[PDB]
Every structure is written in C-alpha cells, then in structure tokens.
Structure 1
Amino acid sequence: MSQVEPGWHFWLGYGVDTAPCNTPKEKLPIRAYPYKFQPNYTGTPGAFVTYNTLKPKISAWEPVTKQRS
C-alpha cells in the first residue's frame, strides 16, 4: 500500500470524490521543486538512517603552540 501515490491514497479511502486525475488545476499544490515519490524502504538498504542535524554544542580548542621568547 506504500506504493500508492498520495492523492490516490485519499481517493482510495473515500476521502475525496474527485481523483487527482480529474481535480482542477487550482486545487493542485504548487511545487518549486521536482516531485519524487519514494515508497517505504524498510527491510532494504534504502531504510531511513536517522542522524543529528546539529553539531556538538560545545566546540573544542584546536591546540596551537607558542614558544617562550
């Protein structure tokens, strides 16, 4: 069921009477980016790998040395 594109996932489910085939142009979302449909990739190498979008809060000192002149 993850292979069912959104819009149809709602039409299939009795949410909207009109399919995204027959929807008006104005009800469609405006996208400035290319649409990429990707189903669920669990159990595969394409499973989502979570991570921290941040870096460590405390930055350490990069040691640099000085001579006793």
Structure 2
Amino acid sequence: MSQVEPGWHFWLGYGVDTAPCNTPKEKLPIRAYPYKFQPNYTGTPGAFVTYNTLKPKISAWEPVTKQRS
C-alpha cells in the first residue's frame, strides 16, 4: 500500500468524493520543486538513514606552534 500515490491514499479511504484526476486546479497545491514519489524502502538498502544535521557544539582547537624567539 506504500506504492499508492498520495491523493489516491485519501480518496481510497473515502476521505473525498473527487479524485486527484478530477479535482479542480485551484485545489491543487503549487510546487516550486519537482515531484518524486518514493515508497517505504524498509528492509532494503534504501531505508532511511538518520543522522545529525548539526555539528559538535563545542568546537576544539586545531594546533599550531610558535617558537621562543
């Protein structure tokens, strides 16, 4: 069922009487970005890997040396 595109996942479910194929234009969200539908890839290499969008809060010092002139 993850293969079902949005809109249909809601029409299929009796959330609406009008399908995305016949829903009017103003009711369609505007997108400044391309569409790209990707199912639940669980159990496969494409499973979502989590990570930290941040970097360590306490940045350390990169050594540099001086001479005793």
Range of TM-score over shorter length = over 0.9
Q: TM-score, normalised by structure 2?
A: 0.99
Shift of 1:8: 0.1
In structure 1, runs of 5+ residues without a counterpart are none
Fraction of identical pairs, as percent: 100
- Measured in 2, the distance between the counterparts of 1:16 and 1:53 equals 37
Q: For residues 9 and 49 of structure 1, what CA distance do their matches in structure 2 show?
A: 25
TM-score, normalization by structure 1: 0.99
How far did residue 22 of structure 1 move? 0.2
SS at match of 1:9: helix
Question: Aligned residue pairs: how many?
Answer: 69
CA RMSD of aligned residues (A): 0.3
Runs of 4 or more above 4 Å deviation = none
Q: Which runs of 5+ in 2 are unaligned?
A: none
- For 1:16 and 1:38, the matched residues in 2 are separated by 23
| Residue 9 (structure 2) pairs with residue 6 (structure 1) | no
Measure the CA separation in 1 of the matches of 2:65 and 2:36: 51
